Every structure is written in C-alpha cells, then in structure tokens.
C-alpha cells in the first residue's frame, strides 16, 4: 500500500513502511508561513533524532531500559495485537520522560567515546 | 529485558488546523495564484481504521469561507466605484398601463450623473427595480446604498459561474475522507480513506435550498449540531435531486455611459416586448415525494405519533426571508411560500421572483455591490440537492431559515478531516545498542 | 500437527558435495528461525548452522564456515543445507529444527523448539 | 578551480571537488518563496540520502549490484573518458529504478542490523 | 541551569550542556524572512558539520593536528581556566584556517575508505 | 543621568527618577459631541 | 569583486528567444516603475 496504508496494521507489519510516510513528511502569505512551519517541524524532529544519537536511521536501538511502569504488556502482545495509534495513546503520558532519558544516555555515550579515543 | 527503540515514519496522526492549498482544472472564481490539480489524484483506503469525525468543528469550513470572501473582494476591487451615482433621482413608473404582478417594480428614473470632463453634466434616463430605490419625500428617490455605503460596480467581463475548487493538504498533513454511507456528520466512520486533496466543491451561493450539491448515498440524511436546541440549523441532504427551472422572460436592453476618464456605468435600458415576472417552475409531484421523505426522516428523531408542519419563513430582510441565487449574472430573490406549506399527519408549482441590482453579500454592512444588467432572456436549470430547515406541543413547525453561508459549505466539507502526521515514536524492543 | 521431514542424499566420497533439504508443514514457516544440528553415530548432539526467519542473516559453527551454505525459501516452505568437501568426520544424522533465534520483536527463544526425524549423511 | 570548475573534467577528477558544489547548494514575496523552495529542495536531497543509509557522506558505497543493462561501458571508460553531464544523460531513464533499489536495500539492512543486535 | 547557564563556566564544565543550547537554536513579511534566515543559518552549520565527517554529533574528534601557533596554552589551562567566550576571541583569526584543514582531512578519509572497501 | 556625550550640548540628557511624581490633569468642561453624515458610509464627529 | 569561473571543455546550448530572464526583467521594470510613481499626485481636477 501507499501513504498511511499500514495505519490499521499491527505495529510489526507497519515497521516495513516507515520510508513511505517519511517521504510524505517533506513532499498568499499564509501559505508561505505554512511551508516555513512545515520545514521547522521537520527540522525539529531531525534535530531530536540527532541528539539521541540516531541521525539518519528509521529504526534506532538505544541503551535506555524499559521502565515497565510505562507499559506492562508482553512484547508479542504489543507488536502483534496493537496498532501504532493505540500504542501512541497508551504511552502518551510518558513521552517526555522517555525523551529525557534518551538525551542523557547519548551524552554519556559521547563522553565515553571521547575518552576511549583519547587512549594512546 | 526490553529496551526503548526509536522509530521514525510511524503512521500516526493527531487532529490539526492548518492552511490549505487550492487546486483547479474571466471567471470571478478563477484564481491565477492557484496551482493546477492532479489529473489522477490518489486515494488510499485505510483498513481497520475508525476515525472520529465532527463536521461542526471542522476548521476547513472557516478556511473555505475566508478564501471565498478574499477572492470575491480581490476580483471585484479593480472595477468602477459609482460615487457620482448617489444623487437625487426623479422617477415615474416604467409601465403605467401594465396590470400584471410586475406593476411599479420597474421605475423610469432621471438623474444628472457626471461626464468625462469635470465641468460638464448630462441627463441620464435609466430603469431601476423598486427594491433598489427608496423614496425621499414624478417623485424623488435615492438608491438604497446611499444610506449605508458607496457602491462599487462589478466589472462586466467577470463571470459569476461557480468553478469547482479542490482543497489540498500541505506536506506533513493528510485529509481523511469518511466514505461511510449514511454518516450523519458526527462520530466514527468505518470506511475512512486518506486523500491528498478533496473532490471539487462548487462555490455555489444560495440559501434555504442548496443547489448543484452532492446527493445522499442511500436515503435523505438529516444533520444537526443539536436536534433538541431550536437555535441550530438542520441541514437535510437529499438522495435524489429536484430540478428547478428559473426564467427571466424579458428581452432587456443594456446601455452604457462614461462617468469619468477610464470609468463607465452600465445600466438597464429599454425593455422590449412585454414586461414579465421572473419565476421558477418546480414539478409538484417530485417536490411532494421529496418532502415526504424528509418528513419520514424527521419522524425518526421526533416520534411516530407527532405532526410535522412546514410553513413560510418569518419576516425579515429579503436576503434572508426568501431564496436567493445568482442566475446568469442576475441576482434572483424568490419566495418559497408554496414549497413549505403543508401539515403531515401519520402539474408545476410556480414561485415568483424579484431581481435586485444593489447587492449586499455575506451579511456584511457597507460592502454594497452594483450588479450590471445582463442583456436578453436568462434561463437556469439547477438541481436542488439539500435543504436548510429551522424548527419553531403535538405539532412541530419547520421553516427554511438559512442565511449563514458557512452552512452551505459545511454540507460539502462534512466528509473531510485534516490531520497532522507525527512520525516519531518509541516502543519496547529486544534490541540493545552496542556499548562502548 | 507440526511436521519437519528431511530429504537428502546417502553415501558421498570425500571432496564431493551433498544437498540436504527439510520440508516444513503445520506452522507458518516464515515466522520462525531454522537451524541444523547433527549427531555423529557414536556421539551426542552438536549445532551446525542457524538461519533467521527472513533468511538474509546466517551463522555457522567454525568447523563448517567455509564448506556449508544454509538458505531458505519461505514461499516453498523449504530449508536447504548445501554441503561441500564432506570429510570423514562429517558422517552424522542431520536434523532440521525450528527455533534458535527470534527477530527482535518476538519473545526470546535460544532453544530448539521443534525437531524433524533426521537423515543420515555418510561420507 | 571553484564552483563547477570540474564540469568539463572527467568523472574521476571531478570527484575531488564534491565539497565545492555542495557548499554552493545552500549559500519581495517571490524572492522569499524562492528561498523557501531552495530549502525544501535541499532537504529533499538530504532526506533521500538518509533513506539510502548514506546520511552525511559525499561518497557512499552501497550493496545494489549494477544491472549492466543501465550502462554496459567499461569501468575505466566511464571514469576516464566521460564527464558527469554526459553520464547523467546516458542513464537518465534508469534513475528512478536505481533509487527504488537503493531504498529497498537499506530497509533490509536495517532489519538485519536490528536482529543482529537482538542476539544476547 | 538552562539556556546559556554555562556561558560563564569553564570550557570543560560547559561541554556537558551542549544539548541545551542546541535545542534552543531551532525552537509580517520581515518576521517570515527572519524565520527563513534562521533556517538557512541552521542548515549551513549542519552542512558544515556534514562536510567535516561529524554529522549528528555534538562532540567530534578529528585527524587535524593542533598547529601550536593558533594557541600555545596548556591543555589544562584552556579547559579549566577559560570560558568559551574568551577562547572564541583568542582564536578568531584562525577560524577559517582550521575549517579549511578539516574539510581536506575528510576528503582524504573518504577516498581511503572507498579504496579500502574496494579490496575483495 | 544618561547621555551619549555629556560634553556635547547637542545630545539630549535622559534623567530616570528613583521616585515618581504624581501629576493630575483635568479638562473640567462637560463638552457635548454631535455628529453628521458626510457621504455614504462616512460621518463626521464634532465638538458641540 | 564578483567571481567568474571559466568552464573548460563545456559546450552549453543557448537560446536567447526562450530566455526567461527577459520576462523577469520586464516584470521587475514594470513593478518598480509603478511603485516609484504611485505615491505622487493624481491630476483628476485637470481633466477640464
Ligand atoms: C447549476 O449547474 C447548471 C449546469 O449544470 C448551471 O446552468 C448553466 O448556467 C450557465 C450560466 O447561466 C449557462 O451558460 C450560459 O449558457 C447560455 C446559452 O444560451 C450562453 O448564452 C451563456 O453565454 C453568456 O455568457 C458568456 C460568458 O460565459 C458570454 O460570453 C456570452 O456572450 C453570453 O453573455 C452561457 O454560456 C449554462 O448553459 C447552464 N447550463 C445548462 C445545462 O442550462 C446552473 O446555473 C447552476 N446553478 C447555480 C445556482 O449555479
Ligand atoms: C411570499 O409569498 C407569500 C404569499 O404566498 C407572502 O405571504 C403573505 O404576505 C402578506 C403580506 O404581503 C401577508 O398579509 C400574508 O398573510 C402572507 N401569507 C399569505 C399566505 O398570503 C410573503 O410575504 C411573500 N414573501 C415576501 C418576501 O414578500
Ligand atoms: C484487519 O484486521 C483483520 C483481523 O482479522 C486482519 O486479518 C486484516 O489483515 C487486517 N487488515 C489490515 C490491517 O489492513
Ligand atoms: C520506573 O518508574 C518509576 C517512577 O514512576 C521509578 O521510580 C522506577 O525506578 C522506574 N524503574 C526503573 C527500573 O528505572
Ligand atoms: C505474557 O507472558 C506471561 C509469562 O511471562 C504469560 O503468563 C502471559 O499470559 C503473557 N501474556 C500475553 C498476552 O501473551
Ligand atoms: C494521563 O494522565 C491523565 C490524568 O488525568 C489520565 O486521565 C490519563 O488516563 C493518563 N493517560 C495514560 C496513558 O496514562
Ligand atoms: C439636473 O440638473 C439640473 C441643473 O439645472 C436640474 O435643473 C435638473 O432638475 C436635474 N435633474 C434631476 C433629475 O434632478
Ligand atoms: C437607513 O439605514 C439605517 C441603518 O443605519 C436603517 O435602519 C434605515 O431603515 C435606513 N433607511 C431606510 C429608509 O431604510
Ligand atoms: C467502503 O466503500 C467502498 C466503495 O469505495 C465499498 O466497496 C466498501 O464496501 C465500503 N466498505 C464499508 C465497510 O462500507
Ligand atoms: C441533476 O441530476 C441529474 C440526475 O437526476 C444529473 O444527471 C445531473 O447531472 C444533475 N445536475 C447537476 C448540475 O448536478
Ligand atoms: C431515495 O430514498 C428512497 C427512500 O424510499 C428510495 O426509495 C430511493 O430509491 C432512493 N434513491 C436513490 C437514488 O437512492
Ligand atoms: C449522529 O449519530 C451519532 C451516533 O453516535 C449520535 O450520537 C448523534 O446524536 C447523531 N446526530 C444527529 C444530529 O442525528
Ligand atoms: C442540546 O440542546 C439542549 C437544549 O435544551 C441542551 O439541553 C443539551 O445539553 C444540548 N446538548 C449538547 C450536547 O450540547
Ligand atoms: C431581443 O432583441 C434582439 C434585437 O436585435 C433580438 O435579436 C433577440 O432575438 C431578442 N431576443 C428575444 C428573446 O426576444
Ligand atoms: C423614461 O421617460 C422618458 C420620458 O420622456 C422617455 O423618453 C424614456 O424613453 C423613458 N425610459 C425608457 C427606458 O423608455
Ligand atoms: C426544466 O427544463 C427541462 C428541459 O431542460 C424540462 O425537461 C423540465 O421538465 C423542466 N422542469 C420543469 C419543472 O418544468
Ligand atoms: C402529496 O401531497 C398530499 C398533500 O397535499 C399528501 O397527502 C400526499 O401524501 C403527498 N404524496 C406523497 C407521495 O408524498
Ligand atoms: C416508528 O416505528 C418503526 C416500526 O415500524 C420503528 O422501527 C421506529 O423506531 C419508530 N420510530 C420512533 C421514533 O419511535
Ligand atoms: C397553504 O395551504 C392553505 C390551505 O391549508 C392554502 O389556503 C394556502 O393558499 C396555501 N399557501 C400558502 C402560501 O399559505
Ligand atoms: C580538456 O580536454 C583536454 C583533452 O586533451 C584535456 O587535456 C584537458 O585537461 C581538459 N581540461 C579540463 C577538463 O579542464
Ligand atoms: C537487468 O534489468 C532487467 C530489466 O530491464 C532485469 O530483468 C534483470 O534481471 C536485471 N539484471 C539483474 C542482474 O538484476
Ligand atoms: C572493455 O573490456 C573488454 C574486456 O573485458 C575489452 O575487450 C574492451 O575493449 C574494453 N573496452 C574499453 C573501452 O576499454
Ligand atoms: C529514454 O527513453 C526514450 C523513449 O522515447 C528514448 O528516446 C531515450 O533515448 C531513452 N534514453 C536513454 C538514455 O535510454
Ligand atoms: C564563578 O567563578 C568562581 C570563581 O571562584 C567559581 O567558584 C564559580 O563556580 C563560578 N560560577 C559559575 C561559572 O557559574
Ligand atoms: C603552523 O602554522 C604555520 C603557519 O602560520 C605553518 O608554517 C606551520 O607548518 C604550522 N605547523 C604545523 C605543525 O603544521
Ligand atoms: C604548561 O606545561 C609546562 C610543562 O610542559 C609547564 O612548565 C607550564 O608551567 C605549564 N603551564 C600551565 C599554565 O599549566
Ligand atoms: C587578528 O589580527 C588583527 C590584525 O590587526 C590583530 O589586531 C588581532 O589582535 C588578531 N587577533 C588574534 C586573536 O590573533
Ligand atoms: C557611563 O559610565 C562609563 C563607565 O565606564 C563612563 O565611561 C561613561 O562616560 C558614563 N557615561 C555617562 C553619560 O555618565
Ligand atoms: C563628546 O563631545 C565633545 C564635544 O566637544 C567632543 O570633543 C568629544 O570628542 C565627544 N566624545 C565622544 C566620545 O564622541
Ligand atoms: C454632563 O451633562 C449630562 C447631561 O445629561 C449629565 O448627565 C452629566 O452628569 C454631566 N456631567 C458633568 C460632569 O457635569
């Protein structure tokens, strides 16, 4: 399918269409303002992925453990029996907590890499 | 056991309000700064998606409204301001002999107006409709707009025929189309599909009876913000159209004079043949069947043992009391009293119409427009696709109501919703980043 | 319900090659990782090779890394092991099995969930 | 040389000036619209490089084999006896095919990396 | 602290707040022009980091040696007894020289990586 | 007391007080306001 | 000190009759002319 075709699919299946939605994210004064705001939004998301240490990746694994309080569902339950819309609602209240942890994790990684590189 | 994994490009969205783009295939509605449409637009059906719609909170109606007002003013701004027309006029009846219903509606008025040179004056004779001329007290009259604002003459080259306008989302947004048959304007839709752009919507301007619109998929659909609250309008979408035929059967001549350097005034001249009343013909059987269907659907909300009565609109300004539409460049005001005159308990109809040249659209004050006369006989055949009703006890009384233009545009935009894409999200995955 | 049947050759001389294929039924083939395990006639079991569910990523035991190729066709429900060189020490009953890996979005396995009957490869 | 100085040079020599043209890619309402469109174009190219798994690189090797139908010239013939303008014309009809293959290749790589990382 | 809280801190301590200022870099016609110029500036900095081979990193080590003419201070003196404002003034005259060297270093690295990858 | 240049007599001196001084102005006339129309959509208001 | 970079071994095809720069310059001249002469004096009482 095309843009948002996987919206009703399970979380697992929809991960194979991540590039389709990505391509459609970027694709008289009020109209120009709208284009400028769309650009700023896109850049804010790219900057956020940069800060976390993901950069140009659509799937990015991290070192932040799952708290289990954010969601206590089984791994197969989440990936096989839920859509992304349901998941986004389910953990909306913890989004900023997760983002904060991701930023801190990358900062420690960068310092450790620098110190590892400093060894002769 | 599980780790946070970041995904970008996730098919998730939230309700949003943004600026929309035009698409299209001299006309007053033809915008030069409006992109051509996609000859083969895409529609992607969303399986197992139940999006909640609410047509009464749809920001697309306000956006379309503003676009129509702005376009109207931009199109009619560079024309002729008839400031030297607001003069005293000496008027007599155009036809004393005539005993027809159109007696005294057309007046033969004389005034001095202006000429190209400041230092000269001329004598101008022209015909005006009674609705445009108010007595001062051969009698002296003034134009109705002289007591409100200066009037701008529309450019004769500009056509008012509606052109379908397609609305398109900016990148980062998508439009969801309900596609759920018999959807009543609120609640979940089970057949939701994603589109880049809407279908074409004709900016048809009318009241009480909605012309040249969309038809209901299976049965008449009655939509209202609140059925109980009598202050809300009821939008009734018909499943079949009713054909309505208006004529202006007078071979009217159009004359023009210059009023200043680069400015000219067009006016209604001699009427050839007999003076006749403008009117619409609506078949009686088709209307009676359509109204009966509307009554059945209303009963579904009011009861099987109630009485549904239709009545004429209450007194008020002509622009809101009666039906109003643009036919061939002329602005017709009709009556409708013969359409909503019936008590429902469990071959042609002729509606008279008046034509007015001094136009005050969109319920604005001080934005008077002078519509130039159109030469010859005008005929329009339109499809009645929906009704506006208001509600006034065993018997419920309904009246045409109307007058708020956003209700007509909402009747087409109710199926669309604008959503913003939020492509970034996280989820548990059994995947740990390589450590340092 | 769930079945795995190995089909392949018999006696091979050193320096030759032999292809062994496992046919699967009773479950969704593409949903599970597959592996090969062998048992020498007088010994216990040892792991030989592992292929994931998609088939693009494979792992081998060092003793066969330059000799055996493991592949799968998820449309044919077929797992194939193509062996080269086949030294005297490779005589064994070879089994195909479901399990041994899980593709990140599935619960962990790290065990061999289902075994076939096996086929004897003699050098 | 400076901007586009290598335009008439062979494909090989011009690869050493990739940074010069890159710097010159980014460097009243109609003028503002032009600047906004230039920004959107730049971002579309950067997004496309991101999807392919190249990100911040000017030279990026991939796993997509050459079809040989797209062009059957010798490797030395292409790099020593042609300019980039001639090459772009020569394979214009296959540009979208190549782009599609590159996207698919990266998607498989990302899944394999994730599954490789999942091993304890 | 928050945005620019570390401005008066030593160079070492302020490196732990690099993400805070980064987040605040992106965060009627004249106002729209100002937003467009802010976007162009941001992209120019990101392009420059891309050219140097750093991409999505806040701390990036390179292969360019320190000349010692640019600054002859001790390593601990610079990191423990100076602020970033003082440092920026101290080496302002050498900024373009350093940038030029960084670009050249990455170009050589890219060619060497390509040739290393070419080995069968 | 702030100035671009105290010596240069062409510059203004801005004096910022540390305490305010209260100033009370009155227009103690019960002035009537009348209006007329001067054109369509235009009216002039004047002191009566 | 504007820059000019000679392109060696480049043979670009030109067509002056399809050059969009002429229409752009034309529009710029018309717009500038009108902007410059708009805020002046309209001699409407001279047409006598
Ligand atoms: C609902 O839709 C129907 C169409 O399905 C629509 O009826 C159409 O109205 C237009 C305008 O009134 C008609 O177009 C005119 O047709 C006559 C035929 O004699 C022409 O002479 C007219 O030409 C005049 O205008 C031209 C400028 O466009 C001038 O150049 C010319 O010299 C004339 O002055 C004009 O073409 C059209 O024919 C009808 N269609 C049908 C089938 O009758 C109806 O008006 C719509 N309703 C609403 C409320 O919008
Ligand atoms: C539309 O026509 C109806 C008649 O069919 C008009 O209604 C009558 O108006 C007169 C006043 O002129 C009243 O005395 C009558 O009681 C009304 N009803 C009937 C049944 O005659 C109606 O006013 C017309 N619309 C307009 C705007 O004039
Ligand atoms: C919709 O849900 C059904 C559940 O049985 C599933 O079989 C089907 O594949 C789903 N379709 C999608 C997500 O497009
Ligand atoms: C889970 O979240 C709570 C706060 O809600 C925190 O106290 C706890 O330490 C978290 N668990 C882990 C393992 O970090
Ligand atoms: C989740 O796993 C536990 C075992 O740890 C099991 O008891 C439970 O039923 C599982 N739930 C689902 C929905 O798979
Ligand atoms: C978020 O917090 C609000 C607090 O009122 C609560 O109602 C809501 O259910 C919470 N959502 C989740 C997903 O925890
Ligand atoms: C036109 O102006 C003349 C001026 O002498 C006046 O006598 C005449 O009555 C005016 N016409 C009308 C219709 O008022
Ligand atoms: C003149 O305009 C006022 C509104 O400002 C209106 O009430 C009045 O009726 C108008 N005059 C006539 C004769 O209609
Ligand atoms: C959705 O609409 C299509 C027509 O485009 C129709 O074939 C399909 O049956 C509809 N589905 C539902 C559930 O109404
Ligand atoms: C009016 O309805 C008929 C079907 O009864 C249809 O063929 C015709 O195209 C409609 N006209 C308009 C303008 O929608
Ligand atoms: C309109 O609704 C009536 C309800 O009785 C039905 O008989 C008629 O066939 C419908 N027309 C269409 C075109 O669906
Ligand atoms: C529309 O349908 C919904 C179904 O949930 C109902 O709650 C709502 O009252 C209906 N509105 C009208 C005006 O019929
Ligand atoms: C609908 O209108 C009635 C009028 O009495 C009111 O009581 C009711 O609360 C309204 N419902 C909503 C949902 O606004
Ligand atoms: C109107 O009068 C003109 C006079 O030239 C004539 O040509 C035209 O046919 C007339 N139209 C009608 C409808 O009588
Ligand atoms: C208006 O009346 C005058 C009276 O002399 C007459 O000459 C003129 O023709 C009349 N207007 C029209 C349009 O016939
Ligand atoms: C409207 O005109 C058409 C011819 O175009 C005719 O068939 C139809 O019966 C007319 N309608 C009425 C109500 O007379
Ligand atoms: C036609 O109108 C009459 C009332 O005059 C009504 O009794 C009859 O049922 C109507 N016919 C239909 C088919 O609605
Ligand atoms: C009217 O009666 C029908 C049964 O013929 C029933 O289905 C419907 O709900 C009733 N309507 C009301 C408003 O009670
Ligand atoms: C409405 O119906 C009545 C009969 O009940 C009739 O006398 C009247 O003329 C009809 N029309 C109007 C406009 O009232
Ligand atoms: C132009 O072509 C000639 C061919 O002999 C070559 O020697 C020269 O270096 C080229 N110059 C460029 C590409 O600037
Ligand atoms: C080369 O392209 C053709 C299609 O033009 C395709 O059939 C063929 O398989 C391609 N070759 C390779 C090696 O992929
Ligand atoms: C390309 O290589 C082949 C050998 O594979 C050789 O025969 C041919 O001449 C070469 N062509 C060029 C232009 O170098
Ligand atoms: C691309 O296809 C067109 C088809 O008409 C052909 O004329 C042209 O030569 C082709 N170009 C290449 C580089 O294959
Ligand atoms: C300011 O300087 C003093 C020097 O003694 C130091 O102790 C203090 O931490 C500094 N505070 C900052 C940089 O916020
Ligand atoms: C230091 O800079 C000078 C130029 O100012 C240069 O000549 C010298 O070689 C540089 N030192 C090193 C080690 O590169
Ligand atoms: C820098 O290091 C040298 C030794 O190489 C030492 O003599 C000097 O005092 C140091 N300066 C500072 C400021 O630490
Ligand atoms: C930069 O050069 C100027 C040349 O006048 C000099 O005054 C200034 O001190 C220099 N700055 C540094 C940090 O070398
Ligand atoms: C303000 O204070 C500074 C202190 O350096 C002094 O140089 C300057 O002359 C003062 N200006 C005025 C107007 O007092
Ligand atoms: C201040 O004004 C005096 C006026 O004589 C002038 O001599 C002096 O240079 C000025 N100072 C500055 C800093 O401009
Ligand atoms: C001004 O005169 C009005 C007259 O109605 C009176 O009400 C008002 O109080 C007077 N104000 C003063 C300040 O005298």
Residue numbers in the entry:
A (entry chain B), D (entry chain I), E (entry chain G): 520 to 546, 572 to 664
B (entry chain A): 33 to 57, 66 to 141, 150 to 185, 188 to 309, 312 to 323, 323A, 324 to 397, 412 to 457, ...
C (entry chain C): 1 to 52, 52A, 53 to 82, 82A, 82B, 82C, 83 to 100, 100A, ...
F (entry chain E): 272 to 309, 312 to 321
G (entry chain F): 80 to 127
Copy the relevant paper text.
The N332-GT5 molecule was designed to engage antibodies containing a specific HCDR3 motif (derived from BG18) but bearing diverse VH and VL gene segments. N332-GT5 was designed to induce diverse human BG18-class type I precursors. We conclude that N332-GT5 consistently induced BG18-like type I B cell responses in RMs.
We employed cryo-electron microscopy (cryo-EM) to determine whether N332-GT5-induced BG18 type I BCRs engaged the N332-GT5 trimer with a BG18-like binding mode as predicted by the sequence analysis. We determined structures of three BG18 type I Fabs, each containing distinct genetic features, in complex with the N332-GT5 trimer, and we also determined the structure of the unliganded trimer for comparison. Structural analysis confirmed that all three Fabs had a binding mode similar to that of the BG18 inferred germline (BG18_GL0), with the HCDR3 engaging the base of V3 and the LC straddling the V1 loop. Overall, we conclude that all three BG18 type I Fabs interacted with N332-GT5 using a BG18-like binding mode, which supports our sequence-based definition of a BG18 type I antibody. The approach angles and relative heavy chain-light chain twist of all seven N332-GT5-reactive Fabs clustered around BG18 and its inferred germline, whereas the other N332-dependent bnAbs approached the epitope with a wide range of angles as has been described previously. Thus, the BG18 type I and III Fabs structurally characterized here have clear potential to develop into BG18-like bnAbs.
